[PDB]
Design a protein around this ligand. Structure first.
Ligand SMILES: [K+]
Ligand SMILES: [K+]
Ligand SMILES: [K+]
Ligand SMILES: [K+]
Ligand SMILES: [K+]
Ligand SMILES: [K+]
Ligand SMILES: [K+]
Ligand SMILES: [Mg+2]
Ligand SMILES: [Mg+2]
Ligand SMILES: [Mg+2]
Ligand SMILES: [Mg+2]
Ligand SMILES: [Mg+2]
Ligand SMILES: [Mg+2]
Ligand SMILES: [Mg+2]
Ligand SMILES: [Mg+2]
Ligand SMILES: [Mg+2]
Ligand SMILES: [Mg+2]
Ligand SMILES: [Mg+2]
Ligand SMILES: [Mg+2]
Ligand SMILES: [Mg+2]
Ligand SMILES: [Mg+2]
Ligand SMILES: [Mg+2]
Ligand SMILES: [Mg+2]
Ligand SMILES: [Mg+2]
Ligand SMILES: [Mg+2]
Ligand SMILES: [Mg+2]
Ligand SMILES: [Mg+2]
Ligand SMILES: [Mg+2]
Ligand SMILES: [Mg+2]
Ligand SMILES: [Mg+2]
Ligand SMILES: [Mg+2]
Ligand SMILES: [Mg+2]
Ligand SMILES: [Mg+2]
Ligand SMILES: [Mg+2]
Ligand SMILES: [Mg+2]
Lengths: 56, 48, 117, 142, 110, 103
RNA sequence: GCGAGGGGAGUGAAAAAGAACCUGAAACCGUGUACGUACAAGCAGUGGGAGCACAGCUGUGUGACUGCGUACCUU
RNA sequence: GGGCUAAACCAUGCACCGAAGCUGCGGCAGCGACGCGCGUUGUUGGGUAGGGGAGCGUUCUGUAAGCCUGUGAAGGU
């Protein structure tokens, strides 16, 4: 099965109207190190909820 | 009398037919040959 | 004497595409499609110079009818009355007066009614 | 000079109230359709709605001649295979009496967006009462 | 006035990169950098390096102040395609287009 | 006050100071032209209807300009029949300015 | 990233002449602005036409609503 | 189609709508007359195959050791 007519650039854009990405609503701030981080994830320096959970 | 002021006699230089050059010419498409048959073909026609 | 076609061919294609501005999709971008669209637009325009004279007369008649019936007479009797009264105002003007000078239009209706009586 | 054209932002529309009691359905509908379109005004313009608002009272007392009360059938299809439905005039008056006049008028109005807009100016009621006293409708003897 | 950085001939189709560029168009550069850090797309890595370069250009070459900068313009253009061959069944060959993109970021305090 | 008159096989409703575009007249620019066949004169509530012409009614006008109108393209095309023809057209006009209306 | 690529600086008459280099059309793909578009049925135009924006009543852009209207070639 | 008891059918009459038909106004061309290319006049101008007539533009040769052009050519828009 294949198209009988070439779809338009307009129809291509309409299909892609649901493809846009969503930015992260907001980042969280660690209460001890002050780092920003994804909520419920550890920070880049290894803090979570104010505690040094892992080295490096 | 200069090389750019000489003209041929009126009626002495009729332009040739040019077939197959568009609707407006009157000889476009089939070029006066009509439709199909032996006489429309390249090299077509019966002998004397 | 070899002749390259590019400069003349480009001008011809551009002349058609310029006439196709505002058309949708390939009709304003693609020569093959734009050429057909420009031809069809020309055919319609020839046809509709004739249609325009029909549609406007039809509009004037409808407005004269409404204004005549506001004054108590149908369009067909109004026109016959004006012709019996030797009034030669045409429908374009009668429709203009019907909208912009209702007092003058009433006077024309009275003239038509008198010629019919 | 060019011919006048009515302008949607300055057209004057008035309110009327009509009593359908005992009137012949189709001969009432033509007058309604005419006035909803604006064909009675010198400013009539085919692409502009210059018509009036019309309230129709007593829709369930509209009349029809001959044997139409029992023999006029209203058909419609639900879009489901085999879904052809029907109702007689009398069945329609009993269940949805405003529809009888609304259907008749809709058939005599232009088709398309403008004709649908003209139909919204028609307000049909079964009984003898309406809620549009604020619009001060004038009695219209159609 | 405004400062530009570009990554020309980047290895990604413009359609893919445009999904990321649309996230940051018009944002303050500090917010834009945060958005890109937490976007799990290869194109977010590409765009973030161009944005960082544009910010450095504005500071070093144009004496701008980072806290004032916004992403005033960002767009992705199609670069040249690299043509490759992919063998299919029954001796048939297909063309593969490896599409590239030109990424442009413009930052400015106004 | 306005008046109705015929010119160029058409009718026109005019007031003083208006400019009217007519079919070409064989009159030089700057000259005055008389329209002595007036179909109607209306000045407020006084309305004189010609039967066909108002007695003594005359419209004064000054010829303002001659010219050619916007170009119109004529296209003729018979599909599948190897026929096509095009033609251009510009119609001549004469602009006149109404200077006086007299019953 | 001791990248690719880019921004400055400099050369030059010119660097949108920077080596993927004279000119740099079209298809095709984008960013910005103006207007239209989420109750509306078909060759997508044409005739009529409101509103909005713009430049000086007019010119330009857009085109709600409405009459008419089933591409081209070949055979 | 809506709807219609006429908005159906028959008869008589008078109005009106209605086409690129006819008329009005402006313009162009073919052919023929009549006078001096011009005037006047009559008339014609839907077209496939096809016949006849008249032109546009492109490259190149002469005219041109001329003419235009860095005070901006060709090309592009
Ligand atoms: K032949
Ligand atoms: K250059
Ligand atoms: K280029
Ligand atoms: K339309
Ligand atoms: K074919
Ligand atoms: K065949
Ligand atoms: K003649
Ligand atoms: Mg098919
Ligand atoms: Mg998708
Ligand atoms: Mg032929
Ligand atoms: Mg043959
Ligand atoms: Mg053939
Ligand atoms: Mg045969
Ligand atoms: Mg052979
Ligand atoms: Mg050569
Ligand atoms: Mg061509
Ligand atoms: Mg295009
Ligand atoms: Mg274009
Ligand atoms: Mg219709
Ligand atoms: Mg094999
Ligand atoms: Mg480098
Ligand atoms: Mg050079
Ligand atoms: Mg170049
Ligand atoms: Mg391009
Ligand atoms: Mg609905
Ligand atoms: Mg809507
Ligand atoms: Mg649809
Ligand atoms: Mg239609
Ligand atoms: Mg006609
Ligand atoms: Mg005729
Ligand atoms: Mg004539
Ligand atoms: Mg004829
Ligand atoms: Mg002919
Ligand atoms: Mg030469
Ligand atoms: Mg040359």
């Amino acid at each position: 099965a294949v198209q009988q007519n070439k779809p338009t650039r307009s129809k291509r854009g309409m299909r892609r109207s649901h493809d846009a990405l969503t930015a992260v609503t907001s980042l969280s701030v660690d209460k001890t190190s002050g780092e920003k981080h994804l909520r419920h994830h550890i920070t880049a320096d290894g803090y979570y909820r104010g505690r040094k959970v892992i080295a490096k | 009398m200069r090389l750019n002021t000489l003209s041929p006699a009126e009626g002495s230089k009729k332009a040739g037919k040019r077939l197959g050059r568009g609707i407006g010419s009157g000889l476009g498409k089939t070029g006066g040959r009509g439709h199909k048959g032996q006489k429309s073909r390249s090299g077509g026609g019966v002998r004397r | 004497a070899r002749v390259k076609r590019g400069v003349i061919a480009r001008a011809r294609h551009k002349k058609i595409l310029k006439q196709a501005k505002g058309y949708y999709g390939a009709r304003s971008r693609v020569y093959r499609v734009a050429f057909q669209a420009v031809i069809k637009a020309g055919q319609y325009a020839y046809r509709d110079r004739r249609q325009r004279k029909r549609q406007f007369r039809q509009l004037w008649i409808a407005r004269i009818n409404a204004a005549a019936r506001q004054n108590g007479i149908s369009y067909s009797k109004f026109i016959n009355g004006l012709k019996k009264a030797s009034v030669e105002i045409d429908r374009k003007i009668l429709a203009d007066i019907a909208v912009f000078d209702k007092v003058a239009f009433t006077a024309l209706v009275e003239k038509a009614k008198a010629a019919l009586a | 000079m060019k011919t006048f054209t009515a302008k949607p932002e300055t057209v004057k529309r008035d309110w009327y109230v009509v009593d359908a009691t005992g009137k012949t359905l189709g001969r009432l509908a033509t007058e309604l359709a005419r006035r909803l379109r604006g064909k009675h005004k010198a400013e009539y313009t085919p692409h502009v709605d210059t018509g009036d608002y019309i309230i129709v009272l007593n829709a369930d007392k509209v009349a029809v001649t001959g044997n139409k009360r029992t023999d006029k059938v209203y058909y419609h299809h639900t879009g489901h295979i085999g879904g052809i439905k029907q109702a007689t005039f009398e069945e329609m008056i009993a269940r949805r009496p405003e529809r009888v006049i609304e259907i008749a008028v809709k058939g005599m109005l232009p088709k398309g967006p403008l004709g649908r807009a003209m139909f919204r100016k028609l307000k049909v009621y079964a009984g003898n009462e309406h809620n549009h006293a604020a619009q001060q409708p004038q009695v219209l003897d159609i | 006035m405004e400062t530009i950085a570009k990554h020309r001939h980047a290895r990604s189709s413009a359609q893919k990169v445009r999904l990321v560029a649309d996230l940051i168009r018009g944002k303050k550069v500090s917010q834009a950098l945060d958005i890109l850090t937490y976007t799990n797309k290869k194109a977010a890595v590409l765009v973030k390096k161009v944005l960082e370069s544009a910010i450095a250009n504005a500071e070093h070459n144009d004496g701008a102040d980072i806290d004032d900068l916004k992403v005033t313009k960002i767009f992705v253009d199609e670069g040249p395609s690299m043509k490759r061959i992919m063998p299919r069944a029954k001796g048939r060959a297909d063309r593969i287009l490896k599409r590239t993109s030109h990424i442009t970021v413009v930052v400015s305090d106004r | 006050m306005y008046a109705v008159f015929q010119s160029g096989g058409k009718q026109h409703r005019v007031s003083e100071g208006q400019t009217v575009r007519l079919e070409k007249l064989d009159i030089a620019t700057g000259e005055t032209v008389e329209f002595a066949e007036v179909l109607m004169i209306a000045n407020g509530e006084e309305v004189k209807i010609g039967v066909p012409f108002v007695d003594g009614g005359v419209i004064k006008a000054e010829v303002v300009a001659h010219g050619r109108g916007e170009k119109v393209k004529i296209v003729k095309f018979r599909r599948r029949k190897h026929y096509r023809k095009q033609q251009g057209h510009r119609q001549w006009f004469t602009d006149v300015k109404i200077t006086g209306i007299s019953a």
